[PDB]
Symmetry: D2
C-alpha cells in the first residue's frame, strides 16, 4: 500500500467514516479519516485557492482555502513527516466523484521543496499543455483546450460524471528529507473550480505526497478520493 | 518604545533577567525574557547557520541553529505576529558586547517575505560591500574588506571590544500583514562567526523584526542585545 | 542631471524629437531619443504586459510588450550598462500626460536583480496598498482603492488629466554592478492599463533605472516621460 | 540522432575538428564544431563556476566561466533556440576522457526555466545523494561519498581514467517553448573541479539541452564530449 499524506478539500460529508456533517478541509496522515478538519464554506462556481506548508523544524502541516472576497478556512496538525513519509516522494493532486458529482478543475499548481544539510525543487503551472510531459496523469485525469487540468471525467459541454477518479503527479521524484539535513520544508498552492448541477456535490480534490511508485488503489473511488484502498 | 520580535543567539547567561544558565537560542516577543529557549552548544571559532521561519496559518515561529558536522538546536513558539507587530516592519540583525566580548560577524543573510491577498520581497547577501546602500547600519555595525558585516567593534587587529552595539536593517520596509490577507509568511537565513578571547563570550546576535523607525534604544547594551530599553 | 536607462512605452509620436511616426516601444540610454524602437500596436482599454531583461555577459537589453490574444512586439539594444549606470541604482516606473492624455495604470510589477561575485533582490507587487511604504511616489503617482498604482492624475470619476507626471521607485537601492562581479542580471515585468478619451492618447509609461537620488526633472512633462530635463 | 545544444568547457584542443589550439569555452549548436569560442584560462585543481543564460526575446545564448580571484572568460552566440530545439527537452551535464584524462567533478548544479504565454521549473543541487532519483545517470556517471557528481570514471584514491563518458539529466522533461508563449528563458549554473596528473588534461565538461529521449551516442567518446555521433 502507498504511504499517503494529503490535504483534502472534501465536498461530500461521509459521516460513517469520520467526516463532519459539512464540506470540510482536512489533513490526512495515512488514512482518509482526517487527523484534523475545519468547516469549508464551499462556493460551487467560484475559483478557490489552497495554500499548504510545512517545515521540519516547526513540524506543523497547515492549509488554508479561500475565494476572492470571502472568509478563508484554515486547518493544521502537528506531525513530523520524516517519521511518516520516505525520503523520496512524488507530489500530486487527486480528485474523485462517486454517486454524486462535480467538476474537479485545477487552473494552477505550484510547489516548492527545500532541503538544507541548500537543495531545492520548484515548479509552477498556470497553463497545462495538451501533452504535459512533466506530469504523470493517472486514471481519468486529462488536460483541456483551455489549458486546465481536469482530474475527473467531464463533457466538453461542461457536464461532470460519477464513479470518476484521476490524479496528476509531478514527473520528478522529490527529496523531502535526509539524515544530514537541518531543515526540510515544502509549500504548495493550487487554484480550483468546482461546478455542479447537483444540490449536493461530491467528492473533492486533494494535494498529496506519497511513495514515488504511488498508483490509484482499486476501490479508492468516491469518498476515498483516489488515495486509499480502504477507510481505515 | 519600539515593538520587537527577535530570535536571539544568546552566548552569555544573564540568570538575573531570566536567561537559563547556559548559552541558548531564544524567541523574544516584546521582551528580552525569551518566551521559549533551547540550549545552544556554541562552537566559538566555527561558522554557524540560523534558519528562521513563520507563517500566519501555522502561527508558529521557529528557528534552528547548526554547525557543519555537529548536531543542531531548535526552538519554537506559537504566536500570532499579526497581533504583535505593525503591518509594516523593518528586518535586521543586532549584536552586542558588554563587560565580556566576542566578534559578531555575519557572513551571509537572506530573507523572504510573502503576502497573499501574491506580494513578495526577497533579498540575499553573500558578500557585503564596503558601502551597503541597501542596509541601514546602526551603532558600531560596519562591513569589512573581507565582505563581511561586523555588528560589533573589532580592532584593526581583529580583536573584539566590549560595550559595543550594532545593527543592520534592510533599507526597504516589509509588508508582513494586511487585512485582506489570506497568508503571510517569512523565512530568514544568516551565517555567523563568533570568536572570543574570553572564557565566557558575550553577548550574542539576533535576527529581529520591528517598527520601521526602530533604532538602538539607549542602554540596550550587553545583555539586552541592542533591542530593548530595559529587561522587563 | 540624473543618469537614466529606460524602456519606454510611448503612446504618442513626437516626430520633432526623434520618435517614429507611430506608437512604439523604445530603449532609452541617457536620452529620450530612443537607441532602438519598434512599432507598438496599442490596444487602449486592454491589459498589457511588459517583460524586460538584461545581463552583463550577453550585454543585450531587451523588452517585449504583449496583450492577451494579439501578437507581441519586441525591441533590443546591445549595451554595457556597467559603462552607463552607476554601481548603485533605483528602479522605477514613470508616466506622463501633456496636451493629450490617458490613464497610466499599473496593475502589477516585479523585479529581480542578481550580482554574482550570489547577491540578489526580488520584489513583486500584484496589489498596491493604500500606503506603499516600500515605494517612493514622486509627482502625481498614487495608489487607489482597487489596489492599482496610478502614475498620472485621474479624477474621482476615473477620467485622466493632461500635464501630469508621476513615478514610483522601489524604496531600496539596487546593486547592479561591482568590480569583482562575474555577472549581473536583472528582469522586470509589469502589467498596465491605458484608457484614453483622446483620439491620440499620450504620452506613455516607462520602466527606468537611475542614480539612487533620481527625481522628476522639471519640464520632464509630456513627451519626455518624467525622465529627461530636455529632448537632447 | 539527438538534437543538441551545449556549452562546452573544452580542456583538450582537437585542432583537426575546429577547436582553437587552446583550452576554450564554446557554444555548440547541433555539432561539436562550436559556433563560437573563447580562450579558457584553465586552472586544474581549482573550483570553477559556469553560468549560462538565454531568453527568446534577446536570442543570445551566453556563458561565463570563472574561478575565485581570476579573470573570467565569456562567450555568446546569437541564435533562436525555438528553431533548433523541440518544445520539450531534458537538460543535463556531460563529460568525457579519451587518451588524455582528468576528473570531471560537478560540485553543484542549478537550472531555471520560465515560459510566459508564467510556467517555471527550477532545481538546485549543492549535494548529490548516493541515489539521486531525480537524475538520469548515463554512462559512467555516478555520485560519490562527498555528495559530488563524478561524470567520468575515477578511483577513490583520486586517479581519473581514459575512454570514459558519463552524463546526468534532470529527471523531469522541461518545456522550453510553446506557440502561445511571449518569452522563454533559462539560466543554469554549475561549479566543477578538474584535477589531472597529465600535463595536458582532457577532454571536458558540458551543459547541454536535448530531445527528451537523449542518450549517449556510440563513438561520442573523448573529443565529442558524450554529445555527438560524429564530428560534422
Ligand atoms: O459521491 C458521493 C458518494 O456516493 C456513493 O455513496 C452514496 C451516497 N449516497 C448514496 C445512496 C445510495 C448508495 Br448505494 C450509495 Cl453508495 C450512496 C459512494 O460512491 C461514496 O463513496 C461517495 O462518497
Ligand atoms: O558582557 C556580559 C555581561 O557583562 C556585563 O555585566 C556583567 C557580567 N559579569 C559581570 C561582573 C561584574 C560586573 Br560590574 C558586571 Cl556589570 C558584570 C554587562 O555589560 C551585561 O549586560 C552583559 O551581559
Ligand atoms: O501629450 C502629447 C503632447 O502634447 C503637447 O504638445 C503637443 C501635441 N500636439 C500639440 C498641438 C499644439 C500644441 Br501648442 C502642443 Cl504643445 C501640442 C506636449 O505636452 C508634448 O510634450 C506632448 O508629447
Ligand atoms: O583525450 C584526448 C584525445 O585522445 C584521443 O586522441 C588522441 C590524442 N593524442 C593522440 C595520439 C595518438 C592517438 Br591513436 C590518438 Cl587517438 C590521440 C581521442 O580519444 C580524442 O577524441 C581525444 O580528444
Ligand atoms: Ca467525504
Ligand atoms: Ca544573555
Ligand atoms: Ca513620444
Ligand atoms: Ca576538444
Ligand atoms: K487521516
Ligand atoms: K557547433
Ligand atoms: Mn473528509
Ligand atoms: Mn537570553
Ligand atoms: Mn519615443
Ligand atoms: Mn572545442
Amino acid at each position: 500500500a502507498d504511504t499517503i499524506v494529503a490535504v483534502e478539500l472534501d465536498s461530500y460529508p461521509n459521516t460513517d467514516i469520520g467526516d463532519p456533517n459539512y464540506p470540510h478541509i482536512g489533513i490526512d496522515i495515512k488514512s482518509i479519516r482526517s487527523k484534523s478538519t475545519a468547516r469549508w464554506n464551499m462556493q460551487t462556481g467560484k475559483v478557490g485557492t489552497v495554500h499548504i506548508s510545512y517545515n521540519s523544524v516547526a513540524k506543523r502541516l497547515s492549509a488554508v482555502v479561500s475565494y476572492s472576497g470571502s472568509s478563508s478556512t484554515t486547518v493544521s496538525y502537528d506531525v513530523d513527516l520524516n517519521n511518516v513519509l520516505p525520503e523520496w516522494v512524488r507530489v500530486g493532486l487527486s480528485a474523485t466523484t462517486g454517486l454524486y458529482k462535480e467538476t474537479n478543475t485545477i487552473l494552477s499548481w505550484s510547489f516548492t521543496s527545500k532541503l538544507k544539510t541548500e537543495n531545492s525543487l520548484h515548479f509552477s503551472f498556470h497553463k497545462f499543455s495538451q501533452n504535459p510531459k512533466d506530469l504523470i496523469l493517472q486514471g481519468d485525469a486529462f488536460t483541456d483546450s483551455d489549458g486546465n487540468l481536469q482530474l475527473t471525467k467531464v463533457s466538453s459541454s461542461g457536464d461532470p460524471q460519477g464513479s470518476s477518479v484521476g490524479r496528476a503527479l509531478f514527473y520528478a521524484p522529490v527529496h523531502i528529507w535526509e539524515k544530514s539535513a537541518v531543515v526540510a520544508s515544502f509549500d504548495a498552492t493550487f487554484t480550483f473550480l468546482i461546478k455542479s448541477p447537483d444540490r449536493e456535490p461530491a467528492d473533492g480534490i486533494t494535494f498529496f505526497i506519497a511513495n514515488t511508485d504511488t498508483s490509484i488503489p482499486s476501490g479508492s473511488g468516491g469518498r476515498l478520493l483516489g488515495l486509499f484502498p480502504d477507510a481505515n
